[PDB]
Amino acid sequence: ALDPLSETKCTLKSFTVEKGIYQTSNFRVQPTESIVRFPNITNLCPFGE
């Protein structure tokens, strides 16, 4: 996890890496805050009665 160069070394399992392109890991934007939605929950049961 040092740098993209080392990412290829653990992907190929070799200190020496030849010229080329190697898909080491996967890119993915992780969540940070929920955008939860509800349909304006109101008009509850008549428990006040």
């Binding site: 993209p4 020496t16 392109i21 898909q23 890991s25 992780q30 955008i35």
Partner: protein, 162 residues
Amino acid sequence: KNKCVNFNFNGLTGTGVLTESNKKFLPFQQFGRDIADTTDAVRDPQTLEILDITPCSFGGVSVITPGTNTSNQVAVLYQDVNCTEVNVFQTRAGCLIGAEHVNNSYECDIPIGAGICASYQTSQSIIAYTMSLGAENSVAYSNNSIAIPTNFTISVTTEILP
């Protein structure tokens, strides 16, 4: 909006990117699905607006690197994502970070994709250029001229097959 985030609406939950568009929606339904039954645009549980569910930014860390005996400099290309999700240059395949855009076309040494290749050249560094399809040679042509070879050279071509 415009960010990969978790959600839990009145009818379903998951993770996706919230966007807006002119997509229609039947008021008597809650959420929509795509051709492959994947999460598509859904109805807002609130006042009637159509929420366009864009999938989360996802790809692959395609590391461009020459041979280690030549240099330790490398470049990264995040597949099918723009640079706004994170040297920086937006390519057709994705956001290429760590390569200089060169308008001059050269021979394809490190094939990337979408007509782009890389090479460790000039001090030397990883550069990005369009794949050259050969040298531009407009051959003269007419109805009264022909090229006949005056000399020749016997060449030995090496072919390898398993």
